[PDB]
Design a protein around this nucleic acid. Structure first.
Ligand code: DZ4
Ligand code: MG
Ligand code: MG
Length: 342
DNA sequence: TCTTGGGTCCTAGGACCC
DNA sequence: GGGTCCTAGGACCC
């Protein structure tokens, strides 16, 4: 009993929306991120700029060395939110089984769909068309019998393409597939696996589960299953935000608490406004704060608390500021809150 | 070049409880 | 002594 699962993913999402809204940006290298003097990274970049080596996560310092004519934008969320909202209403036309992973991505289970003679392929195509019409924005898709393979599949023919994997093709496909392409395995993990000869799913299939469990725990079991193309996770549609927070990174580090306090003052309204959006009474399960020093270590203190409170956050922030820091600069302060349990 | 801001989920020790 | 809450931290994702 195989399911038909689609992963959709908008191409170069933030940049695409900029370039839509300003055709002049179309053929020159642009990126959304915080400027160099702001100590920012790149959020995303268009293809002209990727050409040069610009990636997401890359410090803006490096983006500009690498691509000195890089036009840099601060980004417009309402515009990204608006677009997201539309793409989702578009998915809704084809199924209710929709699980968004971020503004620009969603899984659809389309198994029990009656939409295109039950052709997953035709469905993805129909959604990539209609997203283009309607948004002037391209999207790529992956189709597969499970979440992670549709995920990997949606990258394989991007931009503005799609790619299908049938159950027939799966074992071939997993044989040479590098563990790192599996969601949940990044740098650190890949490096461990490698260091013990494991690089592809292929290699994990020759592996003893008992051992994978000894040295990664619940992660070993995931690895092991995914290697076999096993992925039982259902598209759910019911997930809710569990927390919210707000953080800022100074252009220069701060060494005096007077400054730190100044920062927090500026952050609380923002974290109040966001939380009101979702909880007018301001009722939370815990609040707390976050500091990250010059040696880039980061620490957080967070306790049970019943209702967002500016003073308490300033309080605990001073404890923190005293009791852990020992004279390093401080690059960022942030606040945080954990939503009630329902 | 010099390392964001918004989140998720997993681990682990000690408190607390039957 | 075996679970569950509390808190801190880390790897990961977009
Ligand atoms: N590390 C990061 N930090 C901040 N914002 C980020 C980010 N990574 C992504 N974003 C924001 C900006 C991104 O536009 C958006 C979507 O994330 P993707 O789908 O991973 N990347 P995109 O759609 O840009 O390129 P592709 O064509 O390969 O899909 O999330
Ligand atoms: Mg995308
Ligand atoms: Mg994405």
């Amino acid at each position: 009993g195989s399911r038909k699962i689609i992963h959709v993913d908008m191409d170069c999402f933030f940049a695409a929306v900029e370039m839509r809204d300003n055709p002049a940006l179309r053929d020159i290298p642009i990126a959304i991120g915080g400027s160099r003097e702001r100590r920012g990274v790149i959020s995303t970049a268009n293809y002209p700029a990727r050409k040069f080596g610009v990636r997401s996560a890359m410090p803006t310092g490096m983006a500009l060395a690498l691509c000195p004519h890089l036009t840099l934008l601060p980004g417009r969320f309402d515009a990204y939110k608006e677009a997201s909202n539309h793409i989702r209403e578009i998915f809704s036309r084809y199924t209710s089984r929709i699980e968004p992973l971020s503004l620009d991505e969603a899984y659809l289970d389309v198994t029990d769909s009656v939409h295109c003679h039950g052709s997953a392929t035709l469905i993805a195509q129909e959604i990539r068309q209609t997203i283009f019409n309607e948004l002037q924005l391209t999207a790529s898709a992956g189709v597969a019998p499970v979440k992670f393979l549709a995920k990997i599949a949606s990258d394989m023919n991007k931009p503005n393409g799609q790619f299908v994997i049938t159950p027939a093709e799966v074992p071939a496909f997993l044989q040479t597939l590098p563990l790192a392409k599996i969601p949940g395995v990044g740098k650190v993990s890949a490096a461990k696996l490698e260091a013990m000869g494991l690089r592809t799913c292929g290699d994990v299939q020759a592996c003893d589960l008992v051992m994978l469990l000894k040295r990664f725990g619940k992660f070993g079991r995931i690895l092991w299953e995914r290697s076999q193309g096993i992925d039982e996770r259902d598209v759910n549609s019911e997930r809710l935000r569990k927390s919210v927070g707000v953080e800022r990174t100074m252009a220069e580090d701060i060494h005096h608490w007077s400054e730190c306090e100044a920062i927090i003052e500026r952050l609380y309204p923002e974290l109040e406004r966001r939380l009101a959006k979702v909880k007018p009474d301001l009722l939370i399960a815990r609040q707390g704060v976050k500091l990250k020093f010059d040696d880039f270590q980061q620490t957080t203190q967070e306790h049970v608390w019943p209702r967002l409170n500016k003073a308490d956050l300033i309080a605990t922030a001073r404890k923190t500021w005293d009791e852990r820091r020992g004279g390093r600069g401080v690059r960022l302060v942030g606040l945080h809150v954990t939503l009630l349990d329902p």
